[PDB]
């Protein structure tokens, strides 16, 4: 939709959340809040108002795969766009994420150019 759309960036590595927040800012997305894990993420999401989730796969307590499922199973937000950030281009991971209904996915480290594209393609699908 509009670059006002609220993003939730979830990762337990503060440095990486700052990176994605920076890349998003660079792309014009200034509505960004962070979450430090799947549970924190879910607490914030149920509080309603978010339009996009960018999440790490390898996270303690509740990984991004678990977080994505919960999201997709939640009638209130089952259609929420979710971009999965993965540490490697592993086929296992990529498929198990597309399966759980990931809107898209990227391999860290990534650039603004790649993030921009991924985000565009996704906004295309969901006609946003």
From Swiss-Prot:
The keyword Hydrolase does not apply. Mg(2+) binds at residues 11-12, 56, 58. The modification 4-aspartylphosphate is found at residue 56. Changing residue 12 to A: No effect on magnesium binding. GO terms for molecular function: acetyltransferase activity; magnesium ion binding; phosphorelay response regulator activity. Changing residue 11 to A: Abolishes magnesium binding. The keyword Acetylation applies. GO terms for cellular component: bacterial-type flagellum; bacterial-type flagellum basal body, C ring; bacterial-type flagellum rotor complex; cytoplasm; cytosol. Its cofactor is Mg(2+). InterPro entries: CheY-like_superfamily, Sig_transdc_resp-reg_receiver, ST_Response_Regulator. SUPFAM superfamilies: CheY-like. GO terms for biological process: aerotaxis; bacterial-type flagellum-dependent swimming motility; chemotaxis; internal peptidyl-lysine acetylation; phosphorelay signal transduction system; regulation of bacterial-type flagellum-dependent cell motility; regulation of chemotaxis; signal transduction. Binds 1 Mg(2+) ion per subunit. The modification N6-acetyllysine is found at residues 91, 108. It comes from the Bacteria. It is found in: Cytoplasm. Residues 6-123 form the Response regulatory domain. Keywords: Acetylation, Chemotaxis, Cytoplasm, Flagellar rotation, Magnesium, Metal-binding, Phosphoprotein, Two-component regulatory system. Phosphorylated by CheA or acetylated by acetyl-CoA synthetase, depending on which acetate metabolism pathway is available. The major acetylation site seems to be Lys-91. Dephosphorylated (inactivated) by CheZ. Involved in the transmission of sensory signals from the chemoreceptors to the flagellar motors. In its active (phosphorylated or acetylated) form, CheY exhibits enhanced binding to a switch component, FliM, at the flagellar motor which induces a change from counterclockwise to clockwise flagellar rotation. Overexpression of CheY in association with MotA and MotB improves motility of a ycgR disruption, suggesting there is an interaction (direct or indirect) between the c-di-GMP-binding flagellar brake protein and the flagellar stator. Interacts (phosphorylated CheY) with CheZ (via C-terminus). This is Chemotaxis protein CheY. It comes from Escherichia coli (strain K12). The gene is cheY.
């Amino acid at each position: 939709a509009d670059k006002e759309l609220k993003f939730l960036v979830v990762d337990d590595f503060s440095t990486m959340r700052r990176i994605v927040r920076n890349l998003l800012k660079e792309l014009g997305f200034n509505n960004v809040e962070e979450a430090e894990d799947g549970v924190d993420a879910l607490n914030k999401l149920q509080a309603g108002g978010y339009g996009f989730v960018i999440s790490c796969w390898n996270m303690p307590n509740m990984d991004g795969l678990e977080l994505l499922k919960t999201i997709r199973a939640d009638g209130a937000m089952s259609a929420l766009p979710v971009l999965m950030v993965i540490a490697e281009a592993k086929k296992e991971n990529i498929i198990a994420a597309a399966q759980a209904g990931a809107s898209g996915w990227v391999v860290k480290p990534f650039t603004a150019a790649t993030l921009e594209e991924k985000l565009n393609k996704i906004f295309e699908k969901l006609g946003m």
